[PDB]
Design a protein around this ligand. Structure first.
Ligand SMILES: Cc1cc(C)nc(N)n1
Ligand code: NI
Ligand code: NI
Length: 330
């Protein structure tokens, strides 16, 4: 109920934080895994905003209140949580650093914020669930149901006293950035991704793609959002594999609720069907991740390491299917 607000101790604590020097180098790399540095996550986000957008892009007090309140509005769910938020934001930073002047200052700040915020107040339930059982959210938001909620939650956070990090923008740039953020968040609806990716592939292959064309820009940004949302699949295998455990933990909890409502869940969400997971992952990589990073690499060549990593993980799932797994810890 209502929007949660960070404590003074929380945001002041973040203000005083300094990132260990060794990580400054690592954070630049696509494969960087935030996993082992939980206490540093919010500081890691400040760092990325500061490197990408300058230490004066936002008032530091407002930025630190914003970040710690964002954290407090992620729920303690197995996957769509704070850790996922910072991970997605880190992928965006890496894409932007490698593609820096293709994007405006306003686009970089909006996108880094959009990624941090893009799953705000996720409950561990899919759009499929919300719509199947007519959750109130589905009444309010007929398509892209959770994504429209994530955007609404973002704007609610900006509206907290002292949290409006975009207040100092010109009224016109203010409207532009909220639009950048809205579009970016809505684009994290995977339902939209299939069409977007297909469109982009065609525009690329015919050579009509034009980043001076706002609709094209929006689409490229959309695909960047997908690439970042799915970046678990671009990490080193052990990291990818542990993250998959958390994702399925959420799926099986949803499947359980469906069973209570008289409906057998899709196999992916069925905890009595774990034998099908390796094949399910294969389908996911072949249908979603591989094409995503393939097209992104065509459009932004510096993102190639994402695609190489995703390819290596596909291979690992293939090995699992064939019975070639080595030891795994959970
Ligand atoms: C977000 C997501 C969803 C699925 C089915 N697999 C993976 N790896 N990631
Ligand atoms: Ni989402
Ligand atoms: Ni997400």
């Amino acid at each position: 109920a209502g929007t949660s607000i960070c404590t003074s101790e929380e945001w002041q604590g973040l203000m005083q934080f300094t990132l260990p020097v060794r990580l400054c180098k690592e954070i630049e790399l696509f494969h960087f895994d935030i996993g082992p540095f939980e206490n540093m996550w919010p500081g890691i986000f400040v760092y990325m905003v500061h490197r990408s957008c300058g230490t004066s892009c936002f008032e530091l007090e407002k930025l630190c209140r914003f970040i710690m309140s964002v954290k407090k509005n992620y729920r303690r769910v197995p996957y769509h949580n704070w850790k996922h938020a910072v991970t997605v934001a880190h992928c965006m930073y890496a894409i932007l650093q490698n593609n820096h002047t293709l994007f405006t200052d306003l686009e970089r700040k909006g996108l880094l914020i959009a990624c941090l915020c893009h799953d705000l107040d996720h409950r561990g339930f899919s759009n499929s669930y919300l719509q199947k059982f007519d959750h109130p959210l589905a009444a309010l938001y007929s398509t892209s149901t959770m994504e429209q909620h994530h955007f609404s939650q973002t704007v609610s956070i900006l509206q907290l006293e002292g949290h409006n990090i975009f207040s100092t923008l010109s009224s016109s740039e203010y409207e532009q950035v909220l639009e950048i953020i809205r579009k970016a968040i809505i684009a994290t609806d995977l339902a939209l991704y299939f069409g977007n990716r297909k469109q982009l592939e065609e525009m690329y292959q015919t050579g009509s793609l034009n980043l001076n064309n706002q609709s094209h820009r929006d689409r490229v940004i959309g695909l960047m959002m997908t690439a970042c949302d799915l970046c678990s699949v671009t990490k080193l295998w052990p990291v990818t594999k542990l993250t998959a455990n958390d994702i399925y933990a959420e799926f099986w909890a949803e499947g359980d609720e469906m069973k209570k409502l008289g409906i057998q869940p899709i196999p992916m969400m069925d905890r009595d069907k774990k034998d099908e997971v390796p094949q399910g992952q294969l389908g996911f990589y072949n249908a979603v991740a591989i094409p995503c990073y393939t097209t992104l690499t065509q459009i932004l060549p510096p993102t190639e390491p994402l695609l190489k990593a995703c390819r290596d993980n596909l291979s690992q799932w293939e090995k699992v299917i064939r019975g070639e797994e080595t030891a795994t810890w959970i």
